[PDB]
Amino acid sequence: GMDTSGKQAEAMALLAEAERKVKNSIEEACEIYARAANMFKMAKNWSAAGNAFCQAAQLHLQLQSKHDAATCFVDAGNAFKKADPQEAINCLMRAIEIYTDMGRFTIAAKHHISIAEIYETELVDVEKAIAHYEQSADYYKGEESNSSANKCLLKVAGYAAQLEQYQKAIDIYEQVGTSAMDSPLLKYSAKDYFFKAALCHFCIDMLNAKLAVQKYEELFPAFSDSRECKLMKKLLEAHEEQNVDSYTESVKEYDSISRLDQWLTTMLLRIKKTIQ
Amino acid sequence: GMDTSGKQAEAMALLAEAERKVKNSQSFFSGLFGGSSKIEEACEIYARAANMFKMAKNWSAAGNAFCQAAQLHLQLQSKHDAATCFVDAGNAFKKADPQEAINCLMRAIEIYTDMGRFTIAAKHHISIAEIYETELVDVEKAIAHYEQSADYYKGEESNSSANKCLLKVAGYAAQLEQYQKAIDIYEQVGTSAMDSPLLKYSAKDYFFKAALCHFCIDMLNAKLAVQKYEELFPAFSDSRECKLMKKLLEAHEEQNVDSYTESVKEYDSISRLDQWLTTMLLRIKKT
Amino acid sequence: MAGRSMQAARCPTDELSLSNCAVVSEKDYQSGQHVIVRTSPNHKYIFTLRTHPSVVPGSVAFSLPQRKWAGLSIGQEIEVALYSFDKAKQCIGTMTIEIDFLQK
Numbered sequence: 001g002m003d004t005s006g007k008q009a010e011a012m013a014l015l016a017e018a019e020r021k022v023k024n025s026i027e028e029a030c031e032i033y034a035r036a037a038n039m040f041k042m043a044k045n046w047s048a049a050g051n052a053f054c055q056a057a058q059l060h061l062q063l064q065s066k067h068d069a070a071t072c073f074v075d076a077g078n079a080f081k082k083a084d085p086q087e088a089i090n091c092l093m094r095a096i097e098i099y100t101d102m103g104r105f106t107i108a109a110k111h112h113i114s115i116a117e118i119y120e121t122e123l124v125d126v127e128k129a130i131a132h133y134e135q136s137a138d139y140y141k142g143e144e145s146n147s148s149a150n151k152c153l154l155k156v157a158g159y160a161a162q163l164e165q166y167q168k169a170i171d172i173y174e175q176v177g178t179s180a181m182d183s184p185l186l187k188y189s190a191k192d193y194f195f196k197a198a199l200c201h202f203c204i205d206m207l208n209a210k211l212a213v214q215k216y217e218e219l220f221p222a223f224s225d226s227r228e229c230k231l232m233k234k235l236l237e238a239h240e241e242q243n244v245d246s247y248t249e250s251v252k253e254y255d256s257i258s259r260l261d262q263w264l265t266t267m268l269l270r271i272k273k274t275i276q
Numbered sequence: 277g278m279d280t281s282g283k284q285a286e287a288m289a290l291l292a293e294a295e296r297k298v299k300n301s302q303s304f305f306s307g308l309f310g311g312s313s314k315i316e317e318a319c320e321i322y323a324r325a326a327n328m329f330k331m332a333k334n335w336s337a338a339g340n341a342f343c344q345a346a347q348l349h350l351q352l353q354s355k356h357d358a359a360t361c362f363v364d365a366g367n368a369f370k371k372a373d374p375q376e377a378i379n380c381l382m383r384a385i386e387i388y389t390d391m392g393r394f395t396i397a398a399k400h401h402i403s404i405a406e407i408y409e410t411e412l413v414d415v416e417k418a419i420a421h422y423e424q425s426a427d428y429y430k431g432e433e434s435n436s437s438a439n440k441c442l443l444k445v446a447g448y449a450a451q452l453e454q455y456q457k458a459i460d461i462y463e464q465v466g467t468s469a470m471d472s473p474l475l476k477y478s479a480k481d482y483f484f485k486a487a488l489c490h491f492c493i494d495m496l497n498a499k500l501a502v503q504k505y506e507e508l509f510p511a512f513s514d515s516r517e518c519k520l521m522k523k524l525l526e527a528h529e530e531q532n533v534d535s536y537t538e539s540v541k542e543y544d545s546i547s548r549l550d551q552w553l554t555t556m557l558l559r560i561k562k563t
Numbered sequence: 564m565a566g567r568s569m570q571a572a573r574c575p576t577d578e579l580s581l582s583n584c585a586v587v588s589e590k591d592y593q594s595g596q597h598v599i600v601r602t603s604p605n606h607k608y609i610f611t612l613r614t615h616p617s618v619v620p621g622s623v624a625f626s627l628p629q630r631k632w633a634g635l636s637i638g639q640e641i642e643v644a645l646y647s648f649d650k651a652k653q654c655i656g657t658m659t660i661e662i663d664f665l666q667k
Contacts, residue, residue, distance in 0.1 A: 103330075207636045
């Protein structure tokens with residue numbers, strides 16, 4: 001349709017006009033660049049719109065402007081998000097650096113979360129996602145935003161248990177559960193976290209899991225009443241006899257009563273495989 | 277990692293440069309009368325030093341820089357930025373040194389209330405009460421701060437926020453074995469909350485607590501108070517609370533400790549009990 | 564002698580598990596050496612050492628019966644100090660032992 005060709009031609013004309021204006025040597029050039037990038041965005045030419053945005057941001061930063069420069073850098077980053085993830089990462093890193101320089105820690109943490117998200121979803125990398133999530137959690141905890149920090153720590157612990165050693169998962173789950181028990185609204189969920197921790201201990205050895213569950217049961221009396229406690233006690237007893245059939249029966253019955261996360265399935269499969 | 281050493285070294289260098297700048301500022305003013313450009317620039321360096329120190333996880337240095345900047349900008353007659361930096365100290369020294377954060381927040385509160393900005397003063401008072409409560413068991417100061425914040429909020433006509441402060445004050449006072457204040461606050465809030473559409477569902481709970489807080493005084497007045505509450509809020513009868521109180525009263529009327537304990541255990545089994553309720557029930561059972 | 568801290572390990576071999584001797588690294592102790600293991604102020608358990616090459620220095624391997632009797636868990640930290648008997652008074656003359664089939 002007319003949109004593609006017309007907007008592309010107008011964008012090229014505006015880019016040439018801004019280039020000529022700077023060739024005379026200034027805010028007018030930045031305005032022309034911003035308008036041309038906007039029309040590029042309308043034209044669906046996702047690529048090369050971030051290029052114009054970056055050029056405008058650099059030109060504006062040339063005259064000591066930092067706020068609008070950071071906003072346009074973030075704009076170019078999100079524009080490149082779909083067209084080119086790597087340059088989106090770079091633009092977001094620049095914006096994070098500047099925002100941290102002015103000390104707007106919430107914006108930096110949000111951008112770190114976005115960076116971790118793009119890294120984990122499109123590209124394949126867990127360590128970078130873990131580091132970015134940890135940085136965002138540290139920023140938020142410094143800003144005492146407890147819920148976001150808890151979410152980030154839970155995600156990091158989940159990934160660490162998924163691939164990394166279980167000590168990080170043990171620590172994070174224990175800390176989060178301990179913080180959660182006292183909370184009036186959140187107390188009900190606390191059990192969950194504790195349960196997860198216990199399972200990770202089982203991956204190391206049965207005796208470590210036994211001592212950990214004993215300590216948790218002592219610490220949290222309600223945990224004794226949890227169906228989870230009964231399930232782990234039964235599973236540990238079955239494992240202690242090298243009897244796989246009881247293991248399978250208990251797992252199947254528990255799944256029948258309630259569906260599985262597919263994380264518990266993975267951990268239980270790992271534990272069963274090592275029963276020998 | 278590199279962060280600690282690098283940030284520390286750069287922050288020390290920048291802070292020393294700022295100290296030299298402020299040292300030379302007096303000579304510049306005496307010889308040329310440059311104005312406040314040097315002082316403003318020094319304050320900028322100091323604020324940057326504080327923020328970098330915060331990034332470097334060195335909270336004490338950041339708090340010291342914030343306090344210095346507060347003092348310097350207050351010396352420039354800018355009480356608003358001085359109060360902002362006083363609150364910066366209050367929130368930076370909060371973890372490094374709670375005591376310093378206390379006086380910083382008092383200074384900020386005084387500055388703010390000087391202009392009549394009561395909401396910010398009440399928020400700071402609430403923060404200070406939280407600081408007192410979380411670390412120290414000096415309940416009395418927490419009660420005083422909460423009462424002051426509640427009075428400020430009531431003076432601002434912002435209801436539903438002074439209410440929570442009054443509930444906290446009453447709950448803490450009930451722990452000190454002074455029941456009249458707790459009874460009065462609980463009954464007042466309950467009677468206020470009956471009529472609210474959204475809060476109505478919760479109102480019943482308050483009455484329960486009051487009656488329990490009225491239980492330690494003596495059995496007979498608790499019975500009559502139960503009658504008074506029930507006639508005013510007939511729906512209260514439906515709640516399990518009335519049944520539990522009636523059963524406990526019947527058990528205690530004949531010194532039947534076993535029945536009282538069994539009923540308490542059953543109710544806890546159905547729904548886990550709170551530490552406050554557990555303590556109150558244990559105190560009542562002593563009789 | 565004064566006692567050192569380390570991490571409990573798993574018994575390396577079935578024979579050593581049957582020996583009922585705490586398996587140690589040659590670099591840490593010697594075969595026949597005798598120790599007292601502290602897990603807490605009120606928990607002291609008495610063991611005899613036997614060296615095995617596979618033991619990592621700074622760790623001692625214990626069998627499942629030893630772990631259960633002493634309540635020792637793999638990866639837990641424990642202190643251990645060389646203990647010497649008073650053979651003039653602690654040498655054993657008679658042992659009444661309760662025996663049962665290990666596996667039903």
